[PDB]
Amino acid sequence: IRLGCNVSAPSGVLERVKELMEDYSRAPDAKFQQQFRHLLSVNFEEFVAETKERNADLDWVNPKLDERLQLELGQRQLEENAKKRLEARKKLPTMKYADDIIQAVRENQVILIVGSTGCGKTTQVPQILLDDAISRGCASSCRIICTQPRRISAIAIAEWVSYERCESLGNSVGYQIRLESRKARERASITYCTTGVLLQQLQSDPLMHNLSVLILDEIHERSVETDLLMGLLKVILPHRPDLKVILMSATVREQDFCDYFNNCPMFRIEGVMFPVKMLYLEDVLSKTNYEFQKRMKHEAMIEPYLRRIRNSYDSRVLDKLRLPESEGCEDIDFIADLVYYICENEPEGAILVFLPGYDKISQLYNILDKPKTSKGQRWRDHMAVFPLHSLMQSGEQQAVFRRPPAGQRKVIISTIIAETSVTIDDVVYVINSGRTKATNYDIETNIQSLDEVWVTKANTQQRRGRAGRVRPGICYNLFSRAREDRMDDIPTPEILRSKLESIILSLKLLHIDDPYRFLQTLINAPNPEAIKMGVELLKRIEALDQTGTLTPLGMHLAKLPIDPQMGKMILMSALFCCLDPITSAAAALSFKSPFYSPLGKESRVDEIKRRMARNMRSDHLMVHNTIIAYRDSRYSHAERDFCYKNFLSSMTLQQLERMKNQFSELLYNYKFLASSNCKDAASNKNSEKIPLLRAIIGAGLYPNMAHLRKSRRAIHTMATDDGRRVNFHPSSVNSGESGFDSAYFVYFQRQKSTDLFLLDSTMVFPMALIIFGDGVEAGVTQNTPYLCVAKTYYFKCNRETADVVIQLRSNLEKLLLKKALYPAPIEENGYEKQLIKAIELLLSLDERL
DNA sequence: TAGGGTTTT
Hints:
Helix content: 40-55%
Strand content: 5-15%
Shape: globular
GO molecular function, one term: G-quadruplex RNA binding
Strand order of the largest sheet: 4-3-5-2-6-7-1-8
Number of helices: 33
Number of strands: 26
Largest sheet: 8 strands, mixed
GO biological process, one term: DNA geometric change
EC number: 3.6.4.13
Organism: Drosophila melanogaster (Fruit fly)
Number of domains: 4
Pfam families: DEAD, HA2_C, Helicase_C, OB_NTP_bind, WHD_HA2
Radius of gyration: 30 Å
């Protein structure tokens, strides 16, 4: 055993702590307590009964409202506002199956509608059902919820259906995404919402008694949420016979979902796109005649293939397929040539290039921007080149989607962001690398990695679709048909990659107490060892006890829309009066960071983050300081110049502020804060005490610790608590820095790409880990007295301080158990404040002088 | 010295 720095406290400080704890130890209405015990006493039968009396609103119908929307509908279908709209609707393929669909929903509880894009299933199926209920005289019985995976889609689709119905948004159709809603009228209505909104509303209505029809869309994408939702539909619908659900899918393994719902009726609706011709690597080379020069395991794939096409291609075209670099995007000069080829031949239209990630977008941007070849210098002035990437600004401006200036052709260099998330309408040509990046969590080594991999057949068909929204397009795939043959059908469904602590906790609020049982029933059941790992984390942070039952703390965490570790950090900041900086750290880690990474400016972005960090050695507090500067930028009417000079996204910052207010308002509702305003003076009496903020951050990120050992920009010898050598990710503020006041760090995410990096980190102090961690014991090892945390990191510590810290931890354990069970703000002049002050005192010993 | 992409009453 190695022994770290001494953490013993002075006599005078220890005496004040003993007095504070002894004043805390002379202390003698809980709606929450009653609800927590009620959840733990009832079995599932009682819980289904009890939720059916409490959610009874749609037992009530209004016949005069029914009668008036019926008559109003019949005559507004004689106006010429509509009836232009209505015959333009009838040109969508879905509307010819209108009556077959109405009849199928009436006769069956679950149906499935399969259709390619342009078929109108999302637009039309909700209104076919809605207008049928209104026509039949049953308007007020009808409440239609239709889920979508992405926030942008729920809005645009709702604004479209509202237009198709000659209404301002909010009367018959509405949308609800998180922290923004234009709600439809209460009854006879269609609401589009993200799947996550629906999932949060089960906590209050777990058997879906507040809607009459549920439509799940784009389920073939196998997001965690809709895969989760279908699992719970098999629990709910045996108890909701009147509820109608309509599954909706693209033609991507349609049959899986039909199989799941044992064999339900399945419609196939034709689509509307223009033909997109597909070329593979052998076809591109025979048209570009490009030549390369500056493992294998390749040959066994390509040489059989080269014999079955031998008479369909020139022999020299086939010999380039023998090169492993011809495949994918290993040679960017070859992608630049195919861009140059489309510019000379092959008439008007924008080019959409899919490359895996930032590094290879940067490469092809620079070859087209500052060409080395004369062929490319030819074309530099006649291309308007746009990189597209979720950390780049181009998506949140308006030029990437408008048509290019006269005499210039648009070239978009994009990651998979342009497959579904972002949409460009005048694209005619797609260059499909066939390579993207994916995250791989390995249960065996607990190493999450970011690897470049081949795309799936579902992927390439989506990319080919992006070429046929305007004209017949062309799609070039930079890989052979032999490579396509060995591609997977779909990407790994993401629930097999995710960690489950958040889901397991959410299930216990739906009275699904065994997660091994229920998770085994999804389409793709996760590794039961991942569940074991999720449960052990939830046991560690004490959201479940050691028999696995929900604790009072765990019930509050389950009700916060944020991963449960960061949920805990937010509660802590409510009881330790540092709420505004800590909810900033939490929001940013759950959402993304507000900094762009524009091309060519990486070293300048490094300076900005270094300056916003104010030398506090933490990526988390850096964000909070960025947010403090953004508010001052707005108070100053200098917001756009501030965002310009610092490479920050206004819209991300404005979203992080809506999230911090959501957290404080939730905490105010749960009786943990006196005020809902997260910048309130009383909730932030300690918000400037930097050592205390590292303590609360660590209380959330624990047990993700790392210890630093050497120096030299600088070279770091560092390792996580488990012994693996790590480094800070170069995008982190602590990469390469020299002279840390402490050698210990906490982190949210470890990731291997070129090395094992920490993507974010805060420098932390040993006494903070001791107070808020576990695995704390006192003893002697060489002949010196120690005190340790996680039984991993051992610190020299006198026996007077170790006696006080152990007794201080035991009172902190008791205080948290009380505030979870009987929520109230900590009163500024009471017994519980005395314990808090004891902790403020100890941690303050580590401020930089 | 490096950053696939969604999303939460």
